[PDB]
Design a protein around this nucleic acid. Structure first.
Length: 382
DNA sequence: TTTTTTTTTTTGCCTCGCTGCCGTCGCCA
DNA sequence: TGGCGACGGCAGCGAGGC
């Protein structure tokens, strides 16, 4: 229940500081309070019931990863459910770069899950020496083996109902979890968790506060070309979204015709994992100045070199797509840009004008949706 | 109180769309 | 010649507004 007594989690502050001093970002007081609360809850023999909210942008995603020191010394396993493969690979790369100079062993599962990869995963879960695990779409239903589960983090529960939460709750044999949603969610679940899980809303906008230009205009090729010319001034990056059903090759050809001075790569979704890895390598090496991603299978996180985000399909929207894209924008120590095209919504044609007026008066997701979430959590929980 | 003021709105939601999976085929021993 | 891994299609998929 609420108590969920655990074991000894001695801090060893000197080694933690020696391992964490290499962080290339000055800690702000609110982040220091957050990490202090996290380490106090870890050392506390009670449940790992801490609620911390962070976005998908860099800086708000590896702050909770400092618990790796507390999860290695006790010699326990931890897991995280990365929804896609590119994000899983980026996370693995930065984790192994940050935690290189000590004998840690980390493996993960991706779209490369052939027979050899499955045998390797079976061997690693039979050994148990592996510290950190990263899952995929089919992680929940798969029989994942754990001998000593330290903690676990899982988010992005918008593309499906409440089934994975209870499935992972059925996997809580003498272990605790730190499940939290990065994207905003209705606060009824937060109120239900309240009274057992401590509420810690650090809410740090600063330490990366730069100018952000977000606008919206009518569909037009000239404005898109002007934005491309503005962003290619320092090797920036934009993203173009598509239904991934029609001729994405023709869309890319049209983009190349619009800007022949740039080099557009292949940003087609649902392709081979090898091609996805090549696309990630191209993004890391900045070989192609222009590269686009269409859906959640492709758009999972923002790139620090990226500076402009453009949305073209304002007539057909996705309930989960909007939530995913409302958390994947940011930049460090540079100006940020954003624009949106406004095609006329058409469908049953009964309320096309009403839909257009609503899009014009969108008011940033109904103005204060946080107020509505608070008003719902006050009224009820769960 | 029609589907929306996209919201103090309950169990209704239709809608094109994501996907685990099963069968089939090329390949290697 | 047989077993295997990659590939393609399809009906199920929590229970979810335009």
């Amino acid at each position: 229940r609420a108590a969920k007594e655990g074991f000894a989690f001695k801090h060893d502050r000197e080694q933690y500081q020696l391992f964490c001093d290499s962080f290339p970002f000055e800690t702000t007081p609110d982040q220091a309070q957050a990490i202090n609360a996290v380490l106090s809850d870890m050392c506390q023999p009670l449940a790992m019931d801490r609620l911390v909210c962070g976005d998908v942008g860099f800086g708000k995603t590896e702050v909770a990863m400092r618990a790796a020191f507390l999860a290695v010394d006790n010699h326990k396993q931890v897991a995280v459910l990365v929804p896609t493969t590119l994000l899983a690979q980026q996370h693995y790369d930065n984790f192994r770069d940050r935690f290189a100079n000590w004998p840690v062993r980390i493996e993960m599962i991706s779209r490369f899950r052939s027979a050899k990869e499955q045998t390797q995963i079976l061997a690693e879960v039979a050994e148990g020496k592996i510290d950190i695990l990263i899952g995929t779409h089919k992680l929940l239903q798969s029989d994942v083996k754990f001998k000593d589960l330290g903690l676990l983090i899982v988010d992005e529960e918008h593309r499906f109902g409440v089934r994975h939460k209870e499935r992972i709750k059925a996997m809580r044999a003498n272990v605790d979890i730190l499940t939290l949603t990065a994207t905003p969610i209705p606060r009824t679940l937060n109120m239900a968790m309240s009274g057992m899980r401590d509420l810690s809303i650090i809410a740090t906008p600063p330490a990366r506060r730069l100018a952000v230009k977000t606008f919206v205009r009518e569909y037009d090729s000239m404005v898109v070309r002007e934005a491309i010319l503005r962003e290619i001034l320092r090797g920036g990056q934009v993203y173009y979204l598509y239904n991934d059903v029609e001729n994405i090759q023709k869309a890319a050809e049209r983009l190349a015709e619009l800007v022949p001075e740039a080099r557009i790569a292949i940003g087609h979704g649902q392709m081979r994992e090898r091609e996805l890895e090549r696309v990630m390598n191209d993004f890391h090496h900045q070989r192609f100045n222009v590269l686009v991603c269409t859906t959640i299978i492709e758009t999972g996180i923002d790139i620090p070199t990226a500076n402009t985000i453009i949305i073209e399909r304002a007539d057909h929207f996705g309930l989960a797509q909007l939530h995913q894209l409302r958390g994947r924008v940011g930049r460090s120590h540079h100006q940020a840009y954003a624009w949106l095209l406004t095609p006329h919504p058409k469908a049953m044609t009964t309320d096309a004008q009403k839909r257009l007026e609503a899009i014009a008066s969108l008011e940033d997701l109904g103005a204060g949706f946080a107020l509505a979430t608070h008003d719902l959590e006050i009224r009820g929980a769960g």
